[PDB]
């Protein structure tokens, strides 16, 4: 690795210039191949430096200090590179010791709606660039969808929980900057049927294998067979899974049919032989009597009488020859039928017990996408695949909130401030907010730019919770309706004693019906204290929100009793139940590529808004309204690192707009 590993850790190809780089350095990428490799090295080496020590600012001076010839010969190239990497949050992002104390006076004013990770990330960057930044948060806390329950020694995340690998993950840097206790997740997940009995390794492995094979099959349907539109409606993943299962049940029958069809052909071939044998035994029976009657003519006899005896003798042994050759055939076909009837093809494709364990695997997928598989886009639901990180997944053992809180330090954050209206014009913006506690107490905020990090669910509200003046353009609003915003809930169970397998991190529960496969289907053991965490996914997620905490905790204990013993499961000391769809500051959990949407909508969401001119015939205005957030980052949607990066992205785009890009020359 070394320099090339730093490029990978920064999600960049080590030996090629990116599209963004082509924009900022068009002189180099269009120039000779030699210069490009110098550029690439400088970029990579600077990245390495920052990465190797991400707790202190990396200045231009410090960078040039540690470069060789001919890489330190051109100092304006080094400066252009450093500035670029600093602007777009590739270096000097998050929480680091600043060498040169912040600029004495600020330039430009930005209001940031929401203090979730994306908002916070962007805020820190803009403040780093010397801008006046104020965040407006409706909640009485930072972090938004990164929520962490804390009470006594109990620590459990109701929101974001898992770091999906450190290989190229920006959160890898963050974790070195903040005291995050990152614990690996053990892959093994024992299942337990409705009765409370564990699924045997026989079934467990051979149902899961079928699940993975069913997915690959849908991918084959999508890409190879091009099965993507059905009656004008776009085909969902759920639709395609049904179609694949049906075709697998069909094949099972097709096999059985042509197997018994093999039997009737041989059985009916045997029928014809038996008829021939019966008709020959009939003629033998007759011929014997004739030969017998011929031998009643005792010698001496004339020659014709002698001939008759000899004739009938020959004729009989000839027919006895045939019958024995037919009894030879009879023996062969008779065992050929014991052959085919001994090894029948598969009885069923999947049994009722199988189809239930397979439903758990669907529930798992419904949890991962926070949505019923009938809503996911077949073609695109997994479009962000290529950009997944390497390394084992980890959990934040001390609670994920430690991250937003750390980012929130040294920032102007107005909590309990619900943005009601965004007004943007050629000359600037005003944001109208209210106090969440006394809703008549009104605030007005004037700024050069607004960065909107409102959750997609919020942007989807009907009627609007936030009004845009002027209304957002058709292309933007259509993107909002097209896109999917899913739901997923957590049940926190705090006990006085560990009654589960301590070496097992997670164990499943198989529901009775397809309709309730998501309901409390998975349990997490991750924390120091005895806490069990139960997921509600799929269609079940939305319905469990209309049910009281007691009943939910009820069904939780019921299940846990069934697995570990009706007396080994004590009453929970503390319980929490999330309701993300109900939560007015989220209106759901995270986004999914809905059927009829694509990854391209995510781009549309990230595109800023430029108002019309005040005076007609006045020059084209500056862009005023900007969008960051988990639903704006095509390559990392529905995640923390995705939000984090989207924030960094807009902060760069905004600073370029209002402070100017000095590095492009």
């Amino acid at each position: 690795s070394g320099v090339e590993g730093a490029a990978f850790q920064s999600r960049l190809p080590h030996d090629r210039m990116t599209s963004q780089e082509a924009a900022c350095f068009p002189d180099i990428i269009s120039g000779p191949q030699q210069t490009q490799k110098v550029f690439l090295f400088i970029r990579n080496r600077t990245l390495q430096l920052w990465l190797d020590n991400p707790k202190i600012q990396l200045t231009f001076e410090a960078t040039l200090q540690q470069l060789e010839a001919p890489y330190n010969s051109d100092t304006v190239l080094v400066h252009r590179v450093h500035s670029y990497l600093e602007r777009h949050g590739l270096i000097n992002f998050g929480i680091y010791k600043r060498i040169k104390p912040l600029p004495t006076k600020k330039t430009g004013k930005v209001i940031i709606i929401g203090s979730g990770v994306s908002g916070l990330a962007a805020a820190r960057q803009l403040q780093s660039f010397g801008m006046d930044v104020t965040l407006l948060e409706a909640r009485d806390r930072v972090g938004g969808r990164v929520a962490t329950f804390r009470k006594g020694n109990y620590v459990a995340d109701l929101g974001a929980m898992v770091v999906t690998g450190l290989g190229g993950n920006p959160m890898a840097v963050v974790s070195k900057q903040v005291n995050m206790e990152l614990a690996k997740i053990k892959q093994k997940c024992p299942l337990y049927e409705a009765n409370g009995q564990a699924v045997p390794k026989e079934k467990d492995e051979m149902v899961e294998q079928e699940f993975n094979r069913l997915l690959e099959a849908t991918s084959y349907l999508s890409h190879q067979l091009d099965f993507n539109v059905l009656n004008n409606k776009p085909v969902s993943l759920g639709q395609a899974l049904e179609v694949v299962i049906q075709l697998q049940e069909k094949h099972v029958k097709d096999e059985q049919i042509e197997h018994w069809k093999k039997i009737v052909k041989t059985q009916e071939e045997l029928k014809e032989l038996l008829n021939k044998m019966v008709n020959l035994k009939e003629k033998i029976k007759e011929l014997h009597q004739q030969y017998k009657e011929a031998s009643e003519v005792k010698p001496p006899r004339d020659i014709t009488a002698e001939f008759l005896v000899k004739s009938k003798h020959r004729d009989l042994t000839a027919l006895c020859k045939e019958y024995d050759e037919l009894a030879e055939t009879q023996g062969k076909l008779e065992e050929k039928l014991q052959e085919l009837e001994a090894n029948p093809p598969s009885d069923v494709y999947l049994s009722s017990r199988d189809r239930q364990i397979l439903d758990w695997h669907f529930a798992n997928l419904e949890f991962a996408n926070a949505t019923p598989l009938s809503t996911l886009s077949l073609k695109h639901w997994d479009q962000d695949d290529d950009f997944e990180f390497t390394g084992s997944h980890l959990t934040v053992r001390n609670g994920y909130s430690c991250v937003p809180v750390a980012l929130a330090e040294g920032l102007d954050i107005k909590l309990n401030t619900a943005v009601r209206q965004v007004r943007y014009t050629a000359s600037g913006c005003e944001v109208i907010a209210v106090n969440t506690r006394s809703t008549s107490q009104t605030f007005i905020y004037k700024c050069d730019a607004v960065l909107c990090t409102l959750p997609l669910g919020v942007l989807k509200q009907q009627p609007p919770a936030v009004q845009f003046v002027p209304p957002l353009p058709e292309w933007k609003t259509s993107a909002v309706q097209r896109m999917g915003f899913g739901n997923l809930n957590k049940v926190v169970l705090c006990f006085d004693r560990v009654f589960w397998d301590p070496s097992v991190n997670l164990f499943g529960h198989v529901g009775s019906t397809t309709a309730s496969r998501g309901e409390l289907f998975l349990f997490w053991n991750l924390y120091k204290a005895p806490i069990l965490l139960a997921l509600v996914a799929g269609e079940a997620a939305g319905i469990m929100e209309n049910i009281s905490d007691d009943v939910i905790v009820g069904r939780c204990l019921a299940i846990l009793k069934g697995i570990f013993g009706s007396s080994a499961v004590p009453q929970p000391k503390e319980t929490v139940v999330s309701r993300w769809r109900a939560d007015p500051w989220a209106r759901g959990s995270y986004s999914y590529v809905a059927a009829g949407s694509s990854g391209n909508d995510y781009d549309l969401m990230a595109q800023p808004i430029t108002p019309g001119p005040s005076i007609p015939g006045a020059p084209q205005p500056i862009p005023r309204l900007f969008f960051a957030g988990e639903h704006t980052i095509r390559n990392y949607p529905a995640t923390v690192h995705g939000a984090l990066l989207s924030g960094l992205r807009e902060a760069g785009r905004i600073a370029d707009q209002f402070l100017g890009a000095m590095y492009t020359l």
Binding site: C189, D384, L522, A638
Partner: peptide, 6 residues
Amino acid sequence: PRSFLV
């Protein structure tokens, strides 16, 4: 996303 898949 697929990433969360247990």
